[model samples]
Target: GNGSTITFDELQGLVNSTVTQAILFGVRSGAAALTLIVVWITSRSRKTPIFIINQVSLFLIILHSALYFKYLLSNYSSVT
Candidate 1:
């Protein structure tokens, strides 16, 4: 078992910031894409608008945190 327990924020501090940006972009887009995909699978045959419904709902929460996480990438111009 790993004794070095840490929060995500701590991980950011421990790792390089650019690595973190790469991580953030990957995390943000990956989740939205993957989530919507899986989420879509379940609701695909279920109905229509609900597909958009869940994604719309999904985007809200993801976008909410995404707003902050997205900022991390904006600073990526430095190419650290």
Candidate 2:
């Protein structure tokens, strides 16, 4: 048989699953950013020069995660 469409709440459940995973990733990103900041500060005060390499990329990851969560939910809510 050819695939047509899903039944009621089928896509909704899938969307919820995706949103849950997205939120988890976003929270993990936030925690990483928080840890990075504190560690950077400690290093800065001690003049260790750590947290310098790949630091900008870490920030970019967090920013990308934050914006993606918003975009994913915005589209999902409009259909809900």
Best by TM-score: 2
lDDT tens per residue, model 1, 1-80: 56766678766775767666866875686576667668669877555476666766676676678667768877876366
lDDT of 2: 0.70
- Clash list (residue pairs), candidate 2: none
Runs of candidate 2 with Cα error greater than 4 angstroms are 1-4, 44-80
Model 2, residue 65: what's the lDDT? Answer: 86
Q: Judged by lDDT against the true structure, how good is candidate 1?
A: 0.68
Tell me, what's the RMSD of every candidate? 9.1, 5.8
Off by over 4 Å in 1: 1-17, 45-80
Report the C-alpha lDDT of model 2 over 1-80, residue by residue, as the tens digit. 57758685866886789777977876786677677678877766544344653564666676788689978998778554
